[PDB]
Design a protein around this nucleic acid. Structure first.
Ligand code: IHP
Ligand code: IHP
Ligand code: NA
Ligand code: ZN
Ligand code: ZN
Lengths: 384, 455
RNA sequence: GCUCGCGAUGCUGAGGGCUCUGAUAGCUACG
RNA sequence: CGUAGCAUCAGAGCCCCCCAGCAUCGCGAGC
């Protein structure tokens, strides 16, 4: 009921589990089967009374190359922790609309207006990420197993494999370094059979630890937001996790003025979670506070089982962003740059988020850790 | 509704024969057959139930009327003279023929070179029957030469994407056909060429070439989403490493030979764009155009990744604004079809070699895609030097008054090419059409590569 | 300490095949 | 009113084949 780091971790684990149970008919629903669960919890104080479960999700798979959407209707990455961040973005958009509904609703929105233009979180509002296991890539690859009291730390931390950017590789096991032989995916290349490379969860969480979790579109309204803590339900290796999350790019420099290399609390839970039996389900559930029920997405297609777009896809998010843009006065924008109303350009209007991304990519390259691998440029050239 | 189930309700006593299996892992291919009302049908797929469902598809479509029609899966018919059969049946015939001949050249798909990502081929039609179609050439490959291996003297291939190799081996077929006409007064009836009223030669009537590619060609014809089938036509260049393409920016300088080893790479055009180019200046190239009138593909069959709207854009529609073309040149609008038993995607690395074979060769030639030369470092039969040698042989034989464009004592490859006045003018109009459509400059590779001579 | 080459034992998303079980939509046959 | 037999999903069991990294250990070499 109080908040020192271990009981905070145990509390967020408790909360995400319990919310998941409520949404799955006390874990009796067919959509309770999972190999990885992840969740976001918001805190407003030292009291579990004030702590609320912002989102929950599951999933261990990414999209098949054939199913990338040139309209932003599919989910590329259904690892449970990626999905939980996207559900958090739905919550952030909803809180912006709650804010500017009327001057009486504004006091219940988590945002205020900011001295530097745009909007920011109100004080002592924090976000905690929970994952039932360690994130693929640098935080996991070297030790995919529960730790032991006997020699817990890494015996070879100076190997060049340590810290490397690594891609999930379509149809292959493992997470693969960005070998210096090629770095450009092409849309036609991938449809043909080049395997879709998707940066590992450890790398995405490092990137969120530089540019914030709110993405580029939301940064046009809101100052960057960062996870206060990362809590792992099993497979917690501290040296590996802290390497993966921030310590490998401490060489980053020249970040634009609100951005920083965030170093959230990392922690495991008291009673580590149990490896779930059975095959891993091919679906991913997701829930954001203020939803009546879970949404279930087929991870390999990026869409629900009837083929509808997720409330979490590029296109739905873009639509949320436009709803808010329409209600935001021109003077209150964090960027007055004008860009056409296509997903890719609208993102380019986040000039200093883009600059931050550049410093990130440079830090990895200078560090010898490889060049970040992006999606085919055609992925984001769509309109509403 | 599921085809196997519908056919079971129709003819409940179903025996499906399992015709054995090919490949392993993702390159698995099963074939499943059934006999309905006396006729014998086939289906191909990665897994038995898909092969079975496609056999049942052939069944219900052949014995009864068609099936589901997604719409992008249905095909643009050609510009005029809808000659050769139903579009789908011609498509499936062509794809079977190329796939068969590839089997023949690879000891029924067992040889080490049978493993491939893209298979392409050219098939010649001479009548309305599909009995006397004939495979002219067969090729594979999805890689290009590295600039470290380009030749100042014409001994290396630049581009080994399957369809490009297919066209060049076609050119070998065309030199052979002219040599056939010339070397004996009687072999003219056997040839595909005849003398042209405008001078030079032209193809005999109803001789058509059909291009087959196991996938939509790289570049603009592939920039779309296969499962949302309901988008701007830029030019693109192949990238330094691996398959696929990126669009060109019009403001980048044209290449100069040493300076594109020092700086920006020696970029090569995407297959979608090269095939639009072929739809304007024809497939025979410039040298052959000194001897022959322009030749055009009549069909383009895609063994997978077919979508009618985007293929149409990439092949002709995106330069429908071209005008002022030389005599005999046109914007060719061929048939665009997919096939019934479409190929599955095989995620994985593309092989490093390119197989090529023309009708008349006795065995495949295996080229290292990255060196543009064969297994033993020799120049292939397709490189610029060898083709110019064929062309010079043919120039030694044509009387000077039969040349469609006058040239005497040819010495330099580039000079001989420049002699093709009208072809170079059609090339100029194609480049103009692309620029004025807002789609980009053609990346002309440095012409110092063509400053060489036979001896 | 690392890197490179060779070797060994394991670890960690695809494809394929076969068997069982429940539904759902069918289709026959018989009393 | 039942039983038997002849596409979908959904779950379970037994196999085969990848994947390109990673761990641990050996051998040779270089820094
Ligand atoms: O991490 P994910 O949840 O999978 O989504 C991200 C996100 O794109 P979307 O929020 O539009 O889906 C990034 O965009 P930002 O949030 O940083 O604005 C984008 O990176 P870019 O903005 O630089 O395009 C990145 O795509 P990429 O992999 O090309 O970096 C993409 O990750 P995935 O492509 O793996 O979904
Ligand atoms: O089949 P490709 O590999 O695409 O070869 C063509 C062909 O070159 P060669 O005939 O010497 O092999 C073209 O020549 P023509 O058929 O038009 O005579 C030439 O175009 P030029 O007319 O400008 O020589 C073009 O090169 P480019 O892209 O520079 O126009 C070149 O394609 P590659 O250069 O990519 O091999
Ligand atoms: Na990107
Ligand atoms: Zn992950
Ligand atoms: Zn190509």
């Amino acid at each position: 009921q109080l908040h020192l780091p271990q009981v905070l971790a145990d509390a967020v684990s408790r909360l995400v589990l319990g919310k998941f149970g409520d949404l799955t008919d006390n874990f009796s629903s067919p959509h309770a089967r999972r190999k990885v669960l992840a969740g976001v919890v918001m805190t407003t104080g030292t009291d579990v009374k004030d702590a609320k479960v912002i989102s929950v999700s599951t999933g261990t798979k990414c999209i098949n190359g054939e199913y990338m959407s040139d309209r932003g209707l599919a989910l590329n990455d259904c690892h449970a922790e990626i999905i939980s961040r996207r559900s958090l973005l739905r919550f952030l958009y909803t809180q912006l609309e709650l804010y500017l509904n009327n001057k009486d609703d504004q006091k219940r929105s988590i945002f205020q207006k900011s001295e530097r233009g745009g909007f920011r979180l109100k004080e002592n509002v924090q976000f905690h990420l929970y994952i039932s296991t360690s994130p693929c890539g640098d935080a996991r690859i070297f030790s995919p197993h529960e730790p032991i009291l006997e020699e817990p730390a890494d015996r070879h931390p100076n190997r060049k494999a340590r810290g490397q950017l690594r891609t999930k590789i379509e149809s292959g096991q493992g997470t693969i370094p960005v070998r210096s032989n090629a770095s450009i995916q092409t849309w036609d290349g991938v449809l043909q059979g080049e395997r879709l490379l998707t940066m590992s969860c450890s790398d995405k969480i490092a990137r969120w630890n530089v540019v914030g979790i709110q993405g580029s579109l939301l940064s046009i309204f809101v100052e960057p937001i960062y996870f206060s803590s990362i809590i792992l339900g099993s497979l917690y290796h501290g040296d590996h996790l802290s390497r993966a999350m921030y310590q490998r790019i401490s060489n980053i420099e020249d970040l634009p003025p609100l951005y920083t290399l965030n170093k959230p609390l990392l922690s495991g839970i008291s009673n580590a979670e149990a490896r779930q039996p059975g095959k891993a389900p091919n679906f991913s559930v997701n829930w954001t506070v203020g939803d009546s029920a879970i949404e279930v997405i087929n991870a390999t297609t990026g869409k629900d089982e009837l083929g509808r777009a997720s409330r979490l896809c590029k296109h739905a998010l873009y639509c949320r962003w436009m709803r808010v843009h329409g209600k935001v006065p021109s003077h209150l924008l964090r960027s007055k740059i004008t860009k056409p109303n296509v997903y890719h350009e609208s993102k380019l209007a986040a000039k200093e988020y883009q600059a931050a991304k550049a410093r990130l990519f440079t830090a990895f390259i200078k560090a010898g850790l490889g060049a970040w691998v992006e999606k085919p440029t055609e992925q984001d050239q769509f309109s509403l």
